[PDB]
Design a protein around this ligand. Structure first.
Ligand SMILES: CNc1cncc(NC(=O)[C@@H]2CCOc3ccc(Cl)cc32)c1C
Ligand SMILES: [Cl-]
Lengths: 299, 300
């Protein structure tokens, strides 16, 4: 029993965090094999090719714990700087670079000066921002998921938007969202609620013994989407309904039956009650996160 | 900017998790130097749990009755001893991944990270607090016994909790790393229940100061209160009494934001009276009590 916002164990990622310094700027880097990956703004209307051509290998100071690594090459891939180092990281885990979709969750290992300070769980919002917790020096912190023994790196932190939310790239340097790595007027778009995740969290509440919100009613997918669109909820597709299949079979509540509970919750509120200790409908647990936490998959 | 429920990086603790097996029972152990620490109920059957005599069950065991597995390597048990409700298994290999560590006993209201494990394999990390009723609101399945709670301050891991049981309400009970249970619980399957839980007042105040630091002031008011009047109101909402120690502890946050502790207490009194009226504080529609004053200073 119990339901917590749970992150993946961060140890495999901790052994990859390094400190990257260029001039007056210090931020974090990810050391995998003989390459250190970091935001290209560490060299900073910027002309990154022009700023980079003026740099030499010895301009980049890379620190791994109390050991200085020597940079032997440098190249840019989109908004990520790749620093070739002489030493391969002996703690390099089995890994992949993956680009995630909005609604998907991941763990963030927040770092300062190449030293991990905390781990938290978050989701890629539909507006491509993340609601993170970052201070100055956090740039280069990474997001990941762990599947079996493989670490899938999906995010690298680059900036904070005026509303306090965060923007970053995948590990190939492509931003999530219409953001650019430049000091200019940028804003997060209007956000929406991740419907499939709220339904997954409602199934988690039923598994943990909370059934007050259930009702005898059902709905059609079209009628539910007309309701969900009124409340700034992401449309629910047939793929979402299929992905919720296992949870529906385990609890005995059809996905469209759970959609009828959600419809009533949106139209009437909770009426002083809570669901899994929350007075808001939680959307940062995917169907897989619910299954994993209510089954016990280890890494 | 931003405020999240944040756990400590678990890597230093991952390198200490092992699987301990005795007979039909398998749970987790913590391997530090040449000792593996685990709940003493690993020697019990489900029948033994009603009225176990641990000294009598332990005297019948030998070293080779305890199978300890660290990854794909079996460790050899060369000694065993009981200290309160923890079994200590002396092994022939010191853990090369042993971090700098301490065993600390925490007080209610204190927070810590839990590395939830199954079969000696870590599956997740979350942040939680020692409730005033000495239980924790965790997330544990069968096989999680032996999972540990910790804080990392600087390079030192301070172990403060080892999981032993789940109470009928779905909350959890455990011991410190010296085997002393938190609260009036025993490692027996007798009728046991969590006492009435209360809200950790000093933590809600700390979280209100975190909201002010992140730019949210809607809940502030022109009022102040005496400590006694605040406690008379707090008790009516099941809030823990606020002591002069708590007021002293909140001093730095009060100095940083410019809001006196008793002025912040007056906002809390008004929030308990009126609710949030459709508003949120740090993305929450409830008053959060699982961030200490120390956690707020660390993350903000
Ligand atoms: C979710 N299940 C779970 C989670 N966490 C721990 C457990 N194990 C226990 O509670 C065991 C079995 C039931 O009886 C007792 C009584 C006392 C003690 Cl110290 C341990 C136990 C489970 C079964
Ligand atoms: Cl304490």
């Amino acid at each position: 029993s119990g339901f917590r916002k749970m992150a993946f164990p961060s140890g495999k990622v901790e052994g990859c965090m390094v400190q990257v310094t260029c001039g007056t700027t210090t931020l974090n880097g990810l050391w995998l094999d003989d390459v250190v990956y970091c935001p290209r703004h560490v060299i900073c209307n910027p002309n990154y090719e022009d700023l980079l051509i003026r740099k030499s290998n010895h301009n980049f100071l890379v620190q791994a714990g109390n050991v200085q690594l020597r940079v032997i090459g440098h190249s840019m891939q989109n908004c990520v700087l790749k620093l070739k180092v002489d030493t391969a990281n002996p703690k390099t885990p089995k890994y992949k670079f993956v680009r995630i979709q909005p609604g998907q969750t991941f763990s963030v290992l927040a770092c300062y000066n190449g030293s991990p300070s905390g781990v938290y769980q978050c989701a890629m919002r539909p507006n491509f921002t993340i609601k993170g917790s970052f201070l100055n020096g956090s740039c280069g912190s990474v997001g990941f998921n762990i599947d079996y023994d493989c670490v899938s790196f999906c995010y690298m932190h680059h900036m904070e938007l005026p509303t306090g939310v965060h923007a970053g790239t995948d590990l190939e340097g492509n931003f999530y969202g219409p953001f650019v790595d430049r000091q200019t007027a940028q804003a997060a778009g209007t956000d929406t609620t991740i419907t499939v995740n709220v339904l997954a969290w409602l199934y988690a509440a039923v598994i943990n013994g909370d059934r007050w919100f259930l009702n005898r009613f059902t709905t059609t997918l079209n009628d539910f989407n007309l309701v969900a669109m009124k409340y700034n909820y992401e449309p629910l597709t047939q793929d979402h309904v299929d992905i919720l299949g296992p949870l529906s079979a385990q609890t005995g509540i059809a996905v469209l039956d759970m959609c009828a509970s959600l419809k009533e919750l949106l139209q009437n509120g909770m009426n002083g009650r809570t669901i899994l200790g929350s007075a808001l409908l939680e959307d940062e647990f995917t169907p897989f996160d619910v299954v994993r936490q209510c089954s016990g998959v280890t890494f």
